[PDB]
């Protein structure tokens, strides 16, 4: 246990890391698919303690109401996306987010960091596709810490979060599906490899 003492919290390659997870309209499968949770927490490079937090719920408009599957996984009700803006205003939003964050300056370096490739591989550049929006730059590297945890772990969590919760003996940080609580989670998990002397690096193909 010092066995970690100077080794936890090694100089990482960015100033902050950005975790972001989705959540999504879905069925048991509707299409398009329609970001409805749009979280974003800016953690330290360095200890990775949250310093800030975005957090929108999203309207959707292809499919508006939200199916029983959508809200019994999501915990998300039709009231909670109901007023709210459509992802284009949340992605200016986003962005005006960065900029006040200090995450738009040329010299700050940062990273999206994700549970699995789905939601910027795929969720994302897709809505943003047929929806005729443009992809900031900034959403277009990631670390997916499914993989960064199987390189320091040597273990692939197939069960994502669960997984890894289990492997690192944490207990599980809120409710399961639902996209803030699943990126506190990502960030105890990312804290706790951290202290075992993990840098992380970006998984992404450039
Ligand atoms: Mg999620």
């Given at each position: 246990n010092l066995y970690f003492q100077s080794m936890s919290f090694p100089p990482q390659r960015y100033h902050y890391f950005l975790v972001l997870d989705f959540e999504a309209t879905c069925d048991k499968q509707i299409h398009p698919q329609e970001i409805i949770e749009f979280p974003?927490?800016?953690?330290?490079?360095?200890?990775?303690?949250?310093?800030?937090?975005?957090?929108?719920?999203?309207?959707?408009?292809?499919?508006?109401?939200?199916?029983?599957?959508?809200?019994?996984?999501?915990?998300?009700?039709?009231?909670?996306?109901?007023?709210?803006?459509?992802?284009?205003?949340?992605?200016?939003?986003?962005?005006?987010?960065?900029?006040?964050?200090?995450?738009?300056?040329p010299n700050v370096k940062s990273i999206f960091v994700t549970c699995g490739d789905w939601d910027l591989k795929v969720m994302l550049p897709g809505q943003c596709q047929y929806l005729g929006l443009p992809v900031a730059d900034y959403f277009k590297q990631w670390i997916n810490l499914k993989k960064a945890y199987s390189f320091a772990m040597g273990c692939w969590p197939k069960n994502?979060?669960?997984?890894?919760?289990?492997?690192?003996?944490?207990?599980?940080?809120?409710?399961?599906?639902?996209?803030?609580?699943?990126?506190?989670?990502?960030?105890?998990?990312?804290?706790?490899?951290?202290?075992?002397?993990?840098?992380?690096?970006?998984?992404?193909?450039?």
């Open positions: 974003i927490l800016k953690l330290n490079g360095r200890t990775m303690e949250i310093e800030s937090t975005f957090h929108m719920y999203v309207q959707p408009v292809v499919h508006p109401q939200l199916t029983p599957f959508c809200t019994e996984l999501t915990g998300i009700i039709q009231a909670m996306v109901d007023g709210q803006p459509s992802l284009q205003q949340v992605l200016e939003r986003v962005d005006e987010w960065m900029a006040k964050e200090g995450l738009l300056d994502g979060l669960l997984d890894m919760n289990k492997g690192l003996s944490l207990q599980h940080i809120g409710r399961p599906h639902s996209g803030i609580d699943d990126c506190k989670n990502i960030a105890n998990i990312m804290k706790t490899l951290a202290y075992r002397g993990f840098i992380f690096k970006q998984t992404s193909k450039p």
